[PDB]
Amino acid sequence: ETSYGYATLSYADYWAGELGQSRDVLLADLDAGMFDAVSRATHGHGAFRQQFQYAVEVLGEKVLSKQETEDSRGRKKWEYETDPSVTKMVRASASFQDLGEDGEIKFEAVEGAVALADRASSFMVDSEEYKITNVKVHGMKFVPVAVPHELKGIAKEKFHFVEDSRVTENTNGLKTMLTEDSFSARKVSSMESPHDLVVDTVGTGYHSRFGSDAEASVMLKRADGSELSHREFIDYVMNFNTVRYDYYGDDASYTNLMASYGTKHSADSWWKTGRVPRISCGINYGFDRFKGSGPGYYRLTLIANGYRDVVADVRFLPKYEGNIDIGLKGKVLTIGGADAETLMDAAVDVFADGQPKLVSDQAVSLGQNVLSADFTPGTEYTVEVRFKEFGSVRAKVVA
Amino acid sequence: ETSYGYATLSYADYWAGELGQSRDVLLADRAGDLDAGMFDAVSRATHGHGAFRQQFQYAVEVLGEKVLSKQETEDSRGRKKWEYETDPSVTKMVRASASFQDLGEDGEIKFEAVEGAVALADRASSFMVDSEEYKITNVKVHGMKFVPVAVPHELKGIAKEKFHFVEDSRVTENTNGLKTMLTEDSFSARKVSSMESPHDLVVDTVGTGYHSRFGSDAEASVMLKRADGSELSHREFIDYVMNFNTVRYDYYGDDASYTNLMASYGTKHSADSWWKTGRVPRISCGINYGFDRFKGSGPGYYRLTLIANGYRDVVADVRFLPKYEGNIDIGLKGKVLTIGGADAETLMDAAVDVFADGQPKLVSDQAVSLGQNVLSADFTPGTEYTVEVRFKEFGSVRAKVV
Ligand SMILES: O=S(=O)(O)O[C@@H]1[C@@H](OS(=O)(=O)O)[C@H](O)[C@@H](CO[C@H]2O[C@H](CO)[C@@H](O)[C@H](OS(=O)(=O)O)[C@H]2OS(=O)(=O)O)O[C@@H]1O
Ligand SMILES: [Xe]
Numbered sequence: 188e189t190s191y192g193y194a195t196l197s198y199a200d201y202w203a204g205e206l207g208q209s210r211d212v213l214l215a216d217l218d219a220g221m222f223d224a225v226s227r228a229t230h231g232h233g234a235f236r237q238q239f240q241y242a243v244e245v246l247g248e249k250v251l252s253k254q255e256t257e258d259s260r261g262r263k264k265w266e267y268e269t270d271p272s273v274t275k276m277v278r279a280s281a282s283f284q285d286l287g288e289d290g291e292i293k294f295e296a297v298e299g300a301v302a303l304a305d306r307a308s309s310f311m312v313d314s315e316e317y318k319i320t321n322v323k324v325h326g327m328k329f330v331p332v333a334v335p336h337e338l339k340g341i342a343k344e345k346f347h348f349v350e351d352s353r354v355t356e357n358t359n360g361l362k363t364m365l366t367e368d369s370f371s372a373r374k375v376s377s378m379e380s381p382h383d384l385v386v387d388t389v390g391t392g393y394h395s396r397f398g399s400d401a402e403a404s405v406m407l408k409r410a411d412g413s414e415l416s417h418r419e420f421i422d423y424v425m426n427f428n429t430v431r432y433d434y435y436g437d438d439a440s441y442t443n444l445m446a447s448y449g450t451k452h453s454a455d456s457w458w459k460t461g462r463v464p465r466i467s468c469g470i471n472y473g474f475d476r477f478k479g480s481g482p483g484y485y486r487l488t489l490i491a492n493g494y495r496d497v498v499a500d501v502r503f504l505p506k507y508e509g510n511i512d513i514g515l516k517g518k519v520l521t522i523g524g525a526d527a528e529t530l531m532d533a534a535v536d537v538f539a540d541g542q543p544k545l546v547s548d549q550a551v552s553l554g555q556n557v558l559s560a561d562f563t564p565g566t567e568y569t570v571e572v573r574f575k576e577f578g579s580v581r582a583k584v585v586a
Numbered sequence: 587e588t589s590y591g592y593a594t595l596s597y598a599d600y601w602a603g604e605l606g607q608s609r610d611v612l613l614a615d616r617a618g619d620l621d622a623g624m625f626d627a628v629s630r631a632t633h634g635h636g637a638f639r640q641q642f643q644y645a646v647e648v649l650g651e652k653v654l655s656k657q658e659t660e661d662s663r664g665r666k667k668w669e670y671e672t673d674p675s676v677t678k679m680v681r682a683s684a685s686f687q688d689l690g691e692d693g694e695i696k697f698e699a700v701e702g703a704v705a706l707a708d709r710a711s712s713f714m715v716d717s718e719e720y721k722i723t724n725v726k727v728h729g730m731k732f733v734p735v736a737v738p739h740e741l742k743g744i745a746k747e748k749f750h751f752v753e754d755s756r757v758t759e760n761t762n763g764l765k766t767m768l769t770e771d772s773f774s775a776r777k778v779s780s781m782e783s784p785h786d787l788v789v790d791t792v793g794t795g796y797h798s799r800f801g802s803d804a805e806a807s808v809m810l811k812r813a814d815g816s817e818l819s820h821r822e823f824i825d826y827v828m829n830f831n832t833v834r835y836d837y838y839g840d841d842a843s844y845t846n847l848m849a850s851y852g853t854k855h856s857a858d859s860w861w862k863t864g865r866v867p868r869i870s871c872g873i874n875y876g877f878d879r880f881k882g883s884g885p886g887y888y889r890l891t892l893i894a895n896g897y898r899d900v901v902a903d904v905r906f907l908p909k910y911e912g913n914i915d916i917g918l919k920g921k922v923l924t925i926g927g928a929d930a931e932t933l934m935d936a937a938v939d940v941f942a943d944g945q946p947k948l949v950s951d952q953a954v955s956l957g958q959n960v961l962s963a964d965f966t967p968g969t970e971y972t973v974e975v976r977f978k979e980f981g982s983v984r985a986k987v988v
């Protein structure tokens with residue numbers, strides 16, 4: 188017959204079926220390759236977040252002495268003296284239980300691995316402490332799967348398969364085991380649940396991390412429209428798995444799909460344990476797993492256990508290529524060097540270093556623009572021009 | 587007898603009794619200006635987002651320019667906003683006031699209008715007057731609409747006429763923050779009550795900054811939680827800021843033991859304190875040692891007292907570090923940060939952040955020492971980055987480096 192439960196799949200094993208490729212084809216400071224494990228030299232805060240849903244390994248150096256310091260902001264940090272010659276590599280894994288009333292994440296340890304503490308910078312093994320220096324994430328611990336009776340054994344030993352009465356033939360995201368080493372594309376279910384989330388808004392203006400060509404900030408709310416409580420948001424990210432990127436190029440009607448790309452958490456997507464219900468998705472057009480991507484229209488599909496898929500449509504504007512002249516004199520702002528078309532519905536913000544905006548949400552057009560504010564001669568202002576069809580540009584201008 | 591309720595007091599009327607001064611002694615802009623005076627009405631240049639937040643608890647007026655055209659766009663988070671064209675010669679000034687009802691399940695603030703004033707919408711950038719729209723350009727805040735007071739019978743009449751006094755069964759002789767009307771034009775220092783309620787807030791943590799908001803020499807970010815230790819829900823935080831009135835600053839100079847009080851200062855919202863309607867339960871308080879209302883203040887130990895209707899006072903202690911008077915030199919080359927001009931001890935436990943004007947940080951809290959510092963980053967030649975240096979014994983410093 189057929190058994191249902193959860194299995195642990197690497198990023199390549201998960202995406203092979205989704206992209207109609209093979210695991211081998213998907214294996215090949217920044218992570219610009221395909222779906223090989225996401226390695227990173229880090230502190231361990233990302234390791235803490237990922238130990239719940241992902242197969243994580245952390246490397247650390249033996250601590251000889253440490254001291255907790257507080258800086259001028261009131262933030263506390265542990266400084267360690269270590270022996271780099273003595274290292275330990277362990278699995279970091281925890282089983283999320285709930286968000287306590289005090290806002291703390293409650294969890295249980297997992298046999299065979301250490302359970303990192305929130306904001307972890309070290310871990311312990313045989314009563315020795317190790318400062319975290321590297322983190323490696325291989326894939327997802329909990330992928331809902333259907334396993335043919337004859338593959339059950341191989342599933343258990345090779346993909347840590349564990350039958351679970353919560354997974355059935357109608358589970359959203361269910362992937363079927365096809366051979367001893369491959370799984371099918373996931374099957375989507377339209378089954379609705381009270382806790383389902385939908386997009387509140389999606390932004391492209393927040394750039395939380397360096398290294399992406401574009402970033403989408405997906406703000407979430409409950410399907411019935413209610414805003415999410417901290418606990419509801421946490422229950423969601425504690426079940427979040429991955430995101431699919433569908434690219435429609437310059438097709439604003441989302442009719443002609445050009446390509447689909449898989450992603451790897453941390454490198455391409457991230458979330459925090461705080462109170463803002465946001466999931467960030469970034470893309471770098473130069474990574475191998477995004478070969479062929481560029482500015483344009485995207486459809487992002489967030490995939491989480493027990494929740495309906497969350498689909499978000501976004502547009503990443505191309506960069507405006509040269510030729511824009513800005514002048515400031517008296518109350519007049521003059522713009523030249525670009526087509527009158529390029530500047531249609533254009534707008535600007537103007538502000539002098541470190542000061543509140545002198546000019547904000549000011550619609551403008553090619554030529555002279557008589558404003559309300561006076562630009563004090565000698566003062567150097569920053570002028571940010573927002574275009575309708577291009578990424579915004581900012582230049583320094585002296586009135 | 588004595589009647590109890592709420593009254594509208596100007597900042598000077600409110601602080602006179604708290605500082606043992608008189609209204610007249612407490613009474614003495616354009617974009618870029620700081621409100622560096624005493625307690626006269628806060629009339630500043632602004633977008634209007636602060637205006638929406640203050641219309642609930644404060645007496646606010648907004649000035650706007652006639653809108654000639656507008657186009658919808660989206661902000662960074664994907665929310666709709668408007669870009670405008672206005673006629674600077676046609677302006678209108680109105681009172682902005684709303685009565686807060688509750689936070690909807692959908693996270694939106696529900697409220698009702700107030701006779702004689704417009705009710706701004708969340709994140710408002712304009713307002714309507716006789717079916718015509720005006721883009722907000724200035725805001726003027728006079729004081730607090732709801733101050734709990736005790737009014738002697740003989741004063742009841744002038745109270746209603748001059749301070750918009752309105753009796754209210756929620757206010758009694760035991761109300762925390764109760765101020766007693768002393769004469770036809772003066773109120774006493776507030777009376778503190780230790781009465782505890784389930785909704786009371788306490789300090790969760792306190793953060794300190796030195797270049798966080800334009801104009802502040804130092805600022806404290808007070809994160810809040812419920813008295814029982816529970817994390818606040820968005821609704822619980824909103825109920826608090828919708829009842830928030832002001833903050834008292836008590837200065838202990840260099841006395842880390844908080845034994846010898848050196849002076850007390852009153853504050854004005856928006857100029858000295860601020861909060862948002864988001865999910866983070868934070869209230870920020872700042873100070874500029876050069877403002878007249880803070881005359882004599884300086885680096886040292888402060889005790890901040892948050893004052894809000896129906897809530898126990900929230901007291902927070904914070905220390906603002908001395909200003910580094912030496913002069914530091916910073917340079918960026920390839921993956922190298924060069925630090926000179928300062929002592930060796932002065933750079934002990936120092937750290938830095940490095941980021942281009944409006945870009946994500948390339949360097950976050952990286953320990954540093956005097957001389958050259960190779961970092962996990964490549965600095966684009968010709969690019970001017972911001973380098974913030976946090977010292978152990980001094981306020982942070984930030985500089986522009988190419
Ligand atoms: O205090 S937390 O632990 O919750 O950490 C907060 C951060 O949250 S997070 O979930 O860990 O990311 C916030 O991101 C940060 C700033 O929050 C403000 O800025 C956000 C983006 O810049 C906004 O989305 C927030 O608005 S929201 O309406 O809450 O979504 C905004 O919060 S606020 O308006 O209340 O100030 O604050 C903490 O570090
Ligand atoms: Xe690792």
Ligand SMILES: [Xe]
Pocket residue numbers: 401402403432468469470485
């Ligand atoms: Xe993305």
Ligand SMILES: [Xe]
Pocket residue numbers: 629647648649679724725726
């Ligand atoms: Xe105003």
Ligand SMILES: [Xe]
Pocket residue numbers: 656657658668
């Ligand atoms: Xe509009």
Ligand SMILES: [Xe]
Pocket residue numbers: 804805806835871872873888
């Ligand atoms: Xe402050």
